[PDB]
Amino acid sequence: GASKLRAVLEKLKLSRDDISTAAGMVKGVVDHLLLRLKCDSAFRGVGLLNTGSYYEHVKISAPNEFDVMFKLEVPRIQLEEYSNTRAYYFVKFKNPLSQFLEGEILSASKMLSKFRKIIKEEINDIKDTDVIMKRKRGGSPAVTLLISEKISVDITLALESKSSWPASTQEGLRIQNWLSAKVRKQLRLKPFYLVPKHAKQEETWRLSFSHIEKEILNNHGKSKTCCENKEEKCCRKDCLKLMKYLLEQLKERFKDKKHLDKFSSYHVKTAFFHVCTQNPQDSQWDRKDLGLCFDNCVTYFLQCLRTEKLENYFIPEFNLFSSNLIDKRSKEFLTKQIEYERNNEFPVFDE
Ligand SMILES: [K+]
Ligand SMILES: [Zn+2]
């Protein structure tokens, strides 16, 4: 019940200082690397995009792991959808990237290879930081830093396009009844990002809207003053934290076979945004209703698992839970675990 969930939230707060201290160390190294790249390199136009769980104020664990995005301002990009994937594209131009062009198409593999080598090069001049390599993951994260051989920092390179968003997003970002049609128009005037990502041989890039995800989470109410005063304290962020923690704790129980390896915090975050669409009123997220609101989040996530459908919040035809991405057996296994936990008041949360 809600008392147990409040106790979980209190336990998560115990880690706040370790996470923010580690975030400061990451920022020091990231800033140093950025300055090396901007001064003189093939990536002079690089900039820091402050996106991800820490900047959304929902990173509640893993102080030795951070995800960082670098953006690269590029001239006007023309996109070509890869097959009917909706989220993966070839990048053409209508420039300082000609080196990575093959014909008209900007090569993600060439850009990624240059990026990794250049970062390796600059890191040799930076204190107690080394480049390590994790699983390629289609090209994003591009490269991993290890700081004082403790903190792993995944760095993603993203091209910034200031053009209007691709057609596949036309029916996405269904925030009109929650955050307003005015806000949806405002957000769609912002740039979008392209991250090098294999689509599952090809030089494809995947759309990224991490900056918009941050904006929503940090300005998340129907009321503009949601969470700015004691009368409008909602539980949206608490629910996302509890959903992330639920998944983390379930994965912890299968560290041997890693049966839940295909599931990510991004799945939980995406499902959470859909529940915000379904429950657009701040009165549907009253902090006094934490237990009901968390149940709303858990039951919607269960629905996604059972129906094998979790639409990307910005690209509705990109199904994160399609059997091409996550096998049916894994989704059924997670359904059984979450079903049991929900029916028993989340004993995974017991002390
Ligand atoms: K070094
Ligand atoms: Zn709020």
Q: Which residues have C-beta under 5 Å from ligand 1, the single-atom ion?
A: 123, 126, 129
- Contact 280/180 with Cβ under 8 angstroms? no
Residue numbering of the annotated binding site for 2',3'-cGAMP: 67, 154, 197, 206
CA 322 to chain centre: 18
CA distance 135 to 116: 14
Ligand nearest to the CA of 216: 2
Which residues touch 271 (CB under 8 Å, ≥6 apart)?
A: 243, 297, 300, 301, 304, 310
Asked if residue 96 has a cis previous peptide bond (ω within 30° of 0), the answer is no
Distance 146 CA to ligand 1 centre (A): 9
Query: What resolution, expressed in A, was reported for this entry?
Result: 1.5
The experimental method, as deposited, was X-ray
Distance 153 CA to ligand 1 centre (A): 14
Q: Which residues of 138-159 are buried (b: 16+ CB within 10 A; e: fewer)?
A: bbbbbbbbbbeeebbbbbbbbb
Ligand nearest to the CA of 240: 2
Residue numbering of the annotated binding site for ATP: 53, 65-67, 210-213, 244, 265-269
Residue 327 in tokens: 């096998």
Residue numbering of the annotated binding site: 51, 53, 65-67, 154, 197, 206-213, 220, 226-227, 234, 244, 265-269
Closest CA to 308 of 247, 277, 267, 269: 267
